[PDB]
UniProtKB/Swiss-Prot annotation, chain B:
It is found in: Nucleus, Nucleolus. DNA-dependent RNA polymerases catalyze the transcription of DNA into RNA using the four ribonucleoside triphosphates as substrates. Component of RNA polymerase I (Pol I) which synthesizes ribosomal RNA precursors. Besides, RNA polymerase I has intrinsic RNA cleavage activity. RPA190 and RPA135 both contribute to the polymerase catalytic activity and together form the Pol I active center. In addition, subunit RPA12 contributes a catalytic zinc ribbon that is required for RNA cleavage by Pol I. Three distinct zinc-containing RNA polymerases are found in eukaryotic nuclei: polymerase I for the ribosomal RNA precursor, polymerase II for the mRNA precursor, and polymerase III for 5S and tRNA genes. It comes from the Eukaryota. The chain holds residues 12 to 111 of 1203 of the full protein. Disulfide bonds: none annotated. Transmembrane segments: none annotated. It comes from Saccharomyces cerevisiae (strain ATCC 204508 / S288c). The modification Phosphoserine is found at S70. Belongs to the RNA polymerase beta chain family. This is DNA-directed RNA polymerase I subunit RPA135.
Swiss-Prot record, chain D:
The chain holds residues 833 to 1028 of 1664 of the full protein. It comes from the Eukaryota. This is DNA-directed RNA polymerase I subunit RPA190. It comes from Saccharomyces cerevisiae (strain ATCC 204508 / S288c) (Baker's yeast). Present with 2840 molecules/cell in log phase SD medium. Belongs to the RNA polymerase beta' chain family. Residues 160-172 are annotated as: Bridging helix. Component of the RNA polymerase I (Pol I) complex consisting of 14 subunits: RPA135, RPA190, RPC40, RPA14, RPB5, RPO26, RPA43, RPB8, RPA12, RPB10, RPC19, RPC10, RPA49 and RPA34. The complex is composed of a horseshoe-shaped core containing ten subunits (RPA135, RPA190, RPB5, RPO26, RPB8, RPB10, RPC10, RPA12, RPC19 and RPC40) where RPA135 and RPA190 form the DNA-binding cleft. Outside of the core, RPA14 and RPA43 form the stalk that mediates interactions with transcription initiation factors and newly synthesized RNA.
UniProtKB/Swiss-Prot annotation, chain G:
InterPro entries: RNA_pol_su_RPB10 (IPR023580), RNA_pol_suN_Zn-BS (IPR020789), RPABC5/Rpb10 (IPR000268). Component of the RNA polymerase I (Pol I), RNA polymerase II (Pol II) and RNA polymerase III (Pol III) complexes. Component of the RNA polymerase I (Pol I) complex consisting of 14 subunits: RPA135, RPA190, RPC40, RPA14, RPB5, RPO26, RPA43, RPB8, RPA12, RPB10, RPC19, RPC10, RPA49 and RPA34. The complex is composed of a horseshoe-shaped core containing ten subunits (RPA135, RPA190, RPB5, RPO26, RPB8, RPB10, RPC10, RPA12, RPC19 and RPC40) where RPA135 and RPA190 form the DNA-binding cleft. This is DNA-directed RNA polymerases I, II, and III subunit RPABC5. Present with 5300 molecules/cell in log phase SD medium. Its main location: nucleus. The keyword GTP-binding does not apply. GO terms for molecular function: DNA binding; DNA-directed RNA polymerase activity; zinc ion binding. It is found in: Nucleus, Nucleolus. The lineage of its organism: Eukaryota, Fungi, Dikarya, Ascomycota, Saccharomycotina. GO terms for biological process: nucleolar large rRNA transcription by RNA polymerase I; ribosome biogenesis; RNA-templated transcription; termination of RNA polymerase I transcription; termination of RNA polymerase III transcription; transcription by RNA polymerase I; transcription by RNA polymerase II; transcription by RNA polymerase III. It comes from Saccharomyces cerevisiae (strain ATCC 204508 / S288c) (Baker's yeast).
UniProtKB/Swiss-Prot annotation, chain J:
It comes from Saccharomyces cerevisiae (strain ATCC 204508 / S288c) (Baker's yeast). Coiled coil: none annotated. This is DNA-directed RNA polymerase I subunit RPA34. It is found in: Nucleus, Nucleolus. Belongs to the eukaryotic RPA34 RNA polymerase subunit family. Present with 3360 molecules/cell in log phase SD medium. It comes from the Eukaryota. DNA-dependent RNA polymerases catalyze the transcription of DNA into RNA using the four ribonucleoside triphosphates as substrates. Component of RNA polymerase I (Pol I) which synthesizes ribosomal RNA precursors. Besides, RNA polymerase I has intrinsic RNA cleavage activity. The heterodimer formed by RPA34 and RPA49 stimulates transcript elongation by Pol I. The modification Phosphoserine is found at S34. Component of the RNA polymerase I (Pol I) complex consisting of 14 subunits: RPA135, RPA190, RPC40, RPA14, RPB5, RPO26, RPA43, RPB8, RPA12, RPB10, RPC19, RPC10, RPA49 and RPA34. The complex is composed of a horseshoe-shaped core containing ten subunits (RPA135, RPA190, RPB5, RPO26, RPB8, RPB10, RPC10, RPA12, RPC19 and RPC40) where RPA135 and RPA190 form the DNA-binding cleft. Outside of the core, RPA14 and RPA43 form the stalk that mediates interactions with transcription initiation factors and newly synthesized RNA.
Amino acid sequence: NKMSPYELVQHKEESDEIGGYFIVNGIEKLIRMLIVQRRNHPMAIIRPSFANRGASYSHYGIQIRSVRPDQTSQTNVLHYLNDGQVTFRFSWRKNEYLVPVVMILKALCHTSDREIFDGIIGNDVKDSFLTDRLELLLRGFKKRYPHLQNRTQVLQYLGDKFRVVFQASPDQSDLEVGQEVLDRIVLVHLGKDGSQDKFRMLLFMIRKLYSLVAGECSPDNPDATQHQEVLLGGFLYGMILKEKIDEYLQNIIAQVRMDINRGMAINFKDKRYMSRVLMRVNENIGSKMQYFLSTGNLVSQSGLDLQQVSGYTVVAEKINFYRFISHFRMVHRGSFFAQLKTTTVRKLLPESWGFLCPVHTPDGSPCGLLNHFAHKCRISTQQSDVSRIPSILYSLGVAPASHTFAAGPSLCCVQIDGKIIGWVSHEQGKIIADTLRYWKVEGKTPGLPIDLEIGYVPPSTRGQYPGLYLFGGHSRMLRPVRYLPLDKEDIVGPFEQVYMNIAVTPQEIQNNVHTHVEFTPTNILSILANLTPFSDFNQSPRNMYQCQMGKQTMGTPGVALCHRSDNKLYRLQTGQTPIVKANLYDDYGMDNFPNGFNAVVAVISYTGYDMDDAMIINKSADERGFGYGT
Amino acid sequence: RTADFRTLERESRFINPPKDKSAFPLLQEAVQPHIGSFNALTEGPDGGLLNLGVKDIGEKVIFDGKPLNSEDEISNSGYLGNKLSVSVEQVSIAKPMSND
Amino acid sequence: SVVGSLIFCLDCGDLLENPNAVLGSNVECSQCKAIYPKSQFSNLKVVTTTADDAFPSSLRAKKSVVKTSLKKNELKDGATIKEKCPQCGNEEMNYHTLQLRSADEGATVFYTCTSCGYKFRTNN
Amino acid sequence: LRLTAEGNKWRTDILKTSVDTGREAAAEVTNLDKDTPADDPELLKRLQEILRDNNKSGILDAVTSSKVNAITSQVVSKCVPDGTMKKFPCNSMQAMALSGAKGSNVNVSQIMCLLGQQALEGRRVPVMVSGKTLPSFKPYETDAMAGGYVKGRFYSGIKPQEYYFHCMAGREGLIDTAVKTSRSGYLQRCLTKQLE
Amino acid sequence: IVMTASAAIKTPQMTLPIWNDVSDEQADTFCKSISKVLLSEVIDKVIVTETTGTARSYVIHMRFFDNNEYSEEYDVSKEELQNVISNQFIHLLEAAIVKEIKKQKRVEANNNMNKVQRDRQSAIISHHRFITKYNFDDESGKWCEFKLELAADTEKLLMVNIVEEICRKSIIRQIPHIDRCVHPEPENGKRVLVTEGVNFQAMWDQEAFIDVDGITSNDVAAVLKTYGVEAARNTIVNEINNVFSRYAISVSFRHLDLIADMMTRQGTYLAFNRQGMETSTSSFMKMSYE
Amino acid sequence: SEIEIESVQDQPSVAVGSFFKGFRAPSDTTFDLYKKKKSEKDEFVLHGENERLEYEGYTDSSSQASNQYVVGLFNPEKKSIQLYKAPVLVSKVVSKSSKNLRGPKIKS
Amino acid sequence: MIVPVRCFSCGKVVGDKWESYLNLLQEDELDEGTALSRLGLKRYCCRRMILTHVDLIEKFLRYNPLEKR
Amino acid sequence: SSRHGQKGVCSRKWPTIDMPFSETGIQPDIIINPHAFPSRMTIGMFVESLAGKAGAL
Amino acid sequence: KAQGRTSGKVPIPGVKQALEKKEGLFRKHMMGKRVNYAARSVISPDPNI
Amino acid sequence: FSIPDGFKKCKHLKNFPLNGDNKQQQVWLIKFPSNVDISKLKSLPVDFESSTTMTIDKHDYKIMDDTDNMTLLVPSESKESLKIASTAPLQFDKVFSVSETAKIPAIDYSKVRVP
């Protein structure tokens, strides 16, 4: 861990040992980074598969991916029906469940029917579209469920129906079982004892559903790199581990139940009865974690919030160093998308500027599905603290959300990590979003971290749903640019970048449009895409092929080869540094791993033996050791 | 442009590896998505993501089948026995060692 | 209080029942109680207009201020690409490129003649 | 690969006449007359209306792609045989394309003159929800370059904005091979078994 | 074509040569006389003022376009709208209302109708279930107006969404199996009309615009059903040629004649599939195929 | 244009409630007011009854630590005002009639 | 690894000039162009053999399994 | 392969005896055909060829 | 045609599945075969043959 | 109620004379951030529209007026201490908001775009 390059040599490693992988039976394996949806942001999405879930299902829906502070995720989908009914979908132990949304709204906090009606219709009472959908939803509940008049009677009902599936014990009453349903599934990022906030976000998600079916809002694209983030390898490793330890507590209970089903001898207060149980419970959890890392097969009784069950881990190859370092910059869309015949997910998009490399993606089947991060893209690991940010927004023109009740796209809803904390106008909301970026890069403001992304979405006609979304959590793609007042570094995420004007060079700054400038235009490329000499002069399919061929050269795997027992290594004997190199060749220390050799090359047709893909080597150069390797 | 190869600087660093923090710090910021992610399982606020996740899966309660032979009420049916509530409140990973 | 076809109670906040299918001529709050034997509230006329996307047609598209349809013969991709081709007598031929191969063999050009329209294609 | 000093001025003078092509193709599609400026607020309301429709965006792409391929083919006409530094019985890049040995005049023009319009499945460069085609550009930028018209050439290198659009056109061919797993292997087997 | 011998082509077409005396203005008027026109296409708005009290009265008010507009876009007169709205549309609208209740259980200011309008209105109240009023703009063809009454027992009903689904189903004028007829650019002098859909029985009746002796489809099984097996065989060699001519690939016609004569060898239109293989003499061909 | 502030009151003269839109509460009723003093802050609690309804309120933790409101009083002959500290109460209406609850199982 | 004994293209012996080259850069503080021309390398094929050599043998020799530590 | 996507199989190891030689006396180590350039358009290899020779000098 | 226990991925495919597949017996072993007196290698160019 | 403690009740409350005749006493509801101390200052610059800027110790404030719903609650006498003020629901005549602004600086283009 805390160890010098000198000391790393003395402990039989390379001097610049990189780490980041697992040794499992002597094979180096790592957990592959995946693209998943951005946490805590409801996405208005159209899917034709929503209509496939039954008759009278529209293809519209709101989808939120809520993560708990132990990174366990929970997706709640909000379907719109062709009756004016809205249903609340969730998934629990690989089983979908559907509930009417006014049952959750009446179970989260104590409500009247004005408070649901008031939240959906803040003002804009005189919109006949939205106010007639809403009594189909209220009188749909009062007709179908007529004997549910207060909060501790709808929770009684909801714990009755969900008692067996949540595996509740008989000492749990129904206003406790139904409360476990509302702590474990609906909007888990707002957390337990936060049900007032889970109420306001559902009223936000229903009007954004109604604003989608009215055409006022364009559907959010779940492939568009602003609506997605990176599930990191270590975070997945603790998601899977939590499930394994959860199973361990269930296998104890499975073992004691196999003793009350034989009537043998049970005194729970006995110290040695406990030792008698744990000798028979399988508790080799560390070998179940090795099975995940040895195969990639994801066995989980829950099912995580993930859409495939395999391929989660790969072999860190050492055929040269460029192959090895690019396993760690590699991100994958998901193996669910490899089977589709639609190329919309495989497409290079302008929101990937600075976050995913335009060049470094393979050729063939994974083209556009397997892609690498940009050179200076960083991924958030801890969540920066946001406790002081509500006090700062209230100092600005933000009215508090607890006593406003002013829903609508005619205002700017202010959210921090997916918690709605207030309401402003679109004019004031742009002044708030601009001054907070001014207070952020000037580090004299105590509560704002610099990597807080300020996602101001301005109003439009049939565009994205407006808002003032602030994010500070884990797993966010982030990249550095220069904020042009103060000339300081600013940190920008891909949700922000759609609405920001960021100049490529300082020479192309125009007046009164560009607030930011790139540090270098080479930040948008990969590491391996950035070493290609003069790559702005090549046809772009040839730069993509060099990123593929550069991973497959025989170069230098390492210099600690005598303490290795790999299956096969490829070592080129005498490498040379390049005469023509990039400046970043030195910064990544690629001279420790020479990949090739400088050759006197003649562009000549002379021999007749070099056509269509063929070259000619000098014979006496070869006898003198040119290109030798083992 | 001018972009030199650091030929005396390379050979000094080959023979004499640094006894401080490493040269080439951009190379360790390339795998910071992997190392920092694993480091958040044990270090950081609330004891890390493993100790913070063992308390979301808190209790697993089952009872016995034995009676109290209690007072003849609906409690006589509504008594379930002693309550085993097994739980986990701390997890730790040991840095690896070898044994006897 | 009335919002369109909806009506809510001013004490309990509950939604009242619609005064048409009632029996015995009364409406009230269901949480608390109110008293309305008369069914006092008037006709509630809720005018709803169709969406101006609901009937797409060739005539609605002509009511767009922007252009929604190209002219028939007024687009030819701007050709003076000098290719001495023996097709009719033609010098010009429109082109277009991609990269169809396995990222190693070069771009094959999608040619398109103009004067005779006779399709002539060359890879190399 | 080099143009002569006169011919290198010819392509400068023609490409100066495409600084206004993107706006004049815009004001044709939105039916605005007498050369409204690019920043006109009634133009930007209309271009947003074109953005929200796939049909209307296909018209704006296909009009503008016609007017910049006019500018493209004037440069290739003016410069490719007549304004090069070295000419055909010594210029091997022309001798290979004219003979049919290897290459075409399309390849020679993208080296020596300009790459031209980058076209993505018959349309122009894709554009975000905000009306931007890259973060470098203003929203609803009526410019040929903002829609992916590369005035750069491989001799002199291409700019980072038009480097990114050329990677979009390089991946659209490779993804079509990725949807091309097994197409005609069973068509021929069915014919040859009957017609054996 | 070659496999599956599909009688259900994805895009069945029909090529209609027009005469040498008929003009382009006469032919564009003729394409409008064929193409299907939904009632949705002539409607500008439908304003519904639901009112409850008294039975829930639903006042459906339609705005059409101007009468000169849809007559010069769809060749539709205002008298054709009357015989579609009164006769066809309202039967569908009431069939959708009762169905929706069945699942629910489980400017201008105008007046002064004349006699004939008063008689047309009472003619429609007899034929339908819940109507009780009807009007039409008989003078300018601009608006229609009819005012349903359902019971007081039913609660809220999304009337606008029901009207939109019914309007997008109601045809004003459709010759069957044909959607659209368009007038393309005349390629090599063949002034033709391409029709989205195949019905030879109906284009025979249009003989004052169309040379019926040269009407060509791409549907092979439609030509086989109507014009016989030698005409279906000339279709297959023209369709496989058009697959290759659009890629500038030239195959010889000696290959295409042998494929088309092998498919029509039993008088029918067989494929190169398992069922086309069925009527053959060698069993070891059959066992080795699949 | 300017307005002189005359008096500022620490003590709770006037509170401000937040109910649903259209809420009446007939003028017979009066609601009590309970107050927290954790030695530096103010967290108020509203509560009051009548014959059929019995309903309370509270202040919000996020708001009152950062955003105070003031009820003002302007007479335009003065060109001055006097001010009082106003809490902001997020209040519900639970009906006394429907505080019902059933058994925690099926009893079968 | 170690310096090539001969040059690949020309065939000059070049392997005797690697320690001389590192002293012309260290002691005499020459630039690389003057240091190669005093060593008598003047074909650019023979120049790039000394100019561009990495010398990874110094990095391999730290991993010695025959001596302690 | 060079660093520009110009890969190529070694088709024959050709003796220095009858490989072309320059004014300087140099036989090249690798011969690449100029017919691999017009359809690939890897112009970064042409500028690397004169940049690398300028750096060796 | 013999379902039996019905536990999935049934082994011993019986004398019909030896005859019916892409592999089968007809396609893999009658229609195409492996041969004696044959060879294969990577190809190289030559203007001198 | 019988709620747990800390919640000591408000026995005695102060005077608020809202009389409502028929010059007249307008009822305002103005905002402030919790950082500004109201007794420290003496004047409140007001506007018809939303155009003010006051400066109190390097912090620029602003009325973002939104005049054109929350219930006023007056003390009953001093003990029961709630009457919903009315006339026959007593809407505020003016509602203001003092909000902290900042000054974003202009981009020195002469320094930041070097040729």
